Write a protein that binds this ligand. Sequence first.
Ligand SMILES: *Cc1cc2c(cc1C)nc1c(=O)[nH]c(=O)nc-1n2C[C@H](O)[C@H](O)[C@H](O)COP(=O)(O)OP(=O)(O)OC[C@H]1O[C@@H](n2cnc3c(N)ncnc32)[C@H](O)[C@@H]1O
Ligand SMILES: O=C(Nc1cc(Cl)cc(OC(F)(F)F)c1)Nc1ccccc1CCO
Length: 499
Amino acid sequence: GLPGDLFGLGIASRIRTDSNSTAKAATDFGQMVRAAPEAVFHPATPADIAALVRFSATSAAPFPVAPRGQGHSWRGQALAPGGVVVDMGSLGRGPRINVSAATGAEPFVDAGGEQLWVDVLRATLRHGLAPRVWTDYLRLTVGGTLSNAGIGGQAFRHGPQIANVHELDVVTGTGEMVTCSMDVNSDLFMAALGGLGQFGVITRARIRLEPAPKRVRWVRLAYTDVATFTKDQEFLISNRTSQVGFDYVEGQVQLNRSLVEGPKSTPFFSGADLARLAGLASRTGPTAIYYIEGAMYYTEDTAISVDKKMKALLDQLSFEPGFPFTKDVTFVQFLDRVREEERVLRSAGAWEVPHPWLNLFVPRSRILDFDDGVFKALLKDANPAGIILMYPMNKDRWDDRMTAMTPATDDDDNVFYAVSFLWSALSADDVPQLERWNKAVLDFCDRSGIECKQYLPHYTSQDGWRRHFGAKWSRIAELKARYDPRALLSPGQRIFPVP
Ligand SMILES: *Cc1cc2c(cc1C)nc1c(=O)[nH]c(=O)nc-1n2C[C@H](O)[C@H](O)[C@H](O)COP(=O)(O)OP(=O)(O)OC[C@H]1O[C@@H](n2cnc3c(N)ncnc32)[C@H](O)[C@@H]1O
Ligand SMILES: O=C(Nc1cc(Cl)cc(OC(F)(F)F)c1)Nc1ccccc1CCO
């Protein structure tokens, strides 16, 4: 398949063509798409990626090039059949994380694009520092999350991970190594952020830092009414200047059957907790439970002072009386909380299963209409494995000049919701039902005039991508022709056909 001259290059020592090597880059976390590449490239340095890209770009027979972080995508975005998958991890040979915390200067962290957020955290904490915004799962690459947005519970305050980047090193689709920021090569900087790897491979990111907390007072608050749940979530993300508030705000939608027929205990809830919650979800018939998940960061504060601060906050809210659930953990334990969920799922053989996940950004004015059609009609009697997340964010913390898409509204509403359908197929036979629900959610939004944006979008037609990028589409097409003229990069995204 690949050109013969590729195996004569200085970088050919980093090309792995064996069946066991290519099999490791043939599937992703979704476990639904199988597309083996011709080879896996294990670069020692970012200049090796530049050399591979340049060779393909100047070749008589250009081949697709796809970087692979942790393969934590589910629609074949990191797959390169007929081409080369770049195992980004190989760049992590030696020291790839540098913390700059010199007195009388703004602190930052330079991290390789291949570096895991868990490893960035470990390095910065040694200096009493940490990035401000986190994904829920830390075993994701810097380059992988920055090519999307990187959303989580702190984004309402500081914006997504793409709003917390000073600069990037990018290997373009021509093989050119470019350093970019708001002040130098700003077109590539804005394009790469949420750019789905279309304009180049991120090899370095300079990440914004803030003083690190030591501990976290972590709460889950139960609601039986979607209107009260959303008013409280919006209140929690709308008083950012007040000293009485959460550093992290998320939420969860638990369908009636998921509680009643669910596990005996979870890493957060005991047996007695789940028993009371099952009782609450069935007091006047079957209802879904909506949880607000809040986290309050602290450093040297005493246990009794934290109790008083949390009480002052909870005293403002309208959750079901007697239903606050509380944990007190280290900052690392809070940020790495999903690692414990993964451990439990892997023991049960419920982790390495298909994940036909769907992530939507829903306008706040339509959130109750969305709830009615999706949770109260479509899924009222459903019992999917996995979870459903729901929480609001602030548009004023997102830079709309970056590629990443958020919902557009006629009244410029600052609030939008992230609704994440993280349902798993315990058996590969459960996939068609989950995909039918995914399509039913999207069809419902279409019929109702609810103009959503998919987060981690996946379309197989240019009509889908033009609708997704909207006003930015023409600018995106222009930047693509400039930075990846041969459309070599991350073709698994399926945005651009090969010219
Ligand atoms: C599996 C998963 C994903 C996930 C999550 C929890 C789990 C269990 N929680 C998330 C969260 O709380 N917030 C959020 O914003 N995203 C969350 N995700 C999704 C995840 O961020 C993305 O899927 C992202 O792509 C990171 O994954 P990863 O490092 O594993 O990258 P990949 O799957 O291999 O590649 C995805 C696409 O990006 C391109 N890519 C990869 N690395 C680069 C670099 N360095 N530069 C440019 N493009 C890059 C791939 O080619 C592919 O198209
Ligand atoms: O995967 C996410 N969170 C998450 C949180 C928990 Cl407690 C468990 C979990 O399930 C599983 F199976 F253990 F991994 C996942 N989030 C996510 C995913 C994709 C895009 C955006 C997001 C941010 C939405 O908050």
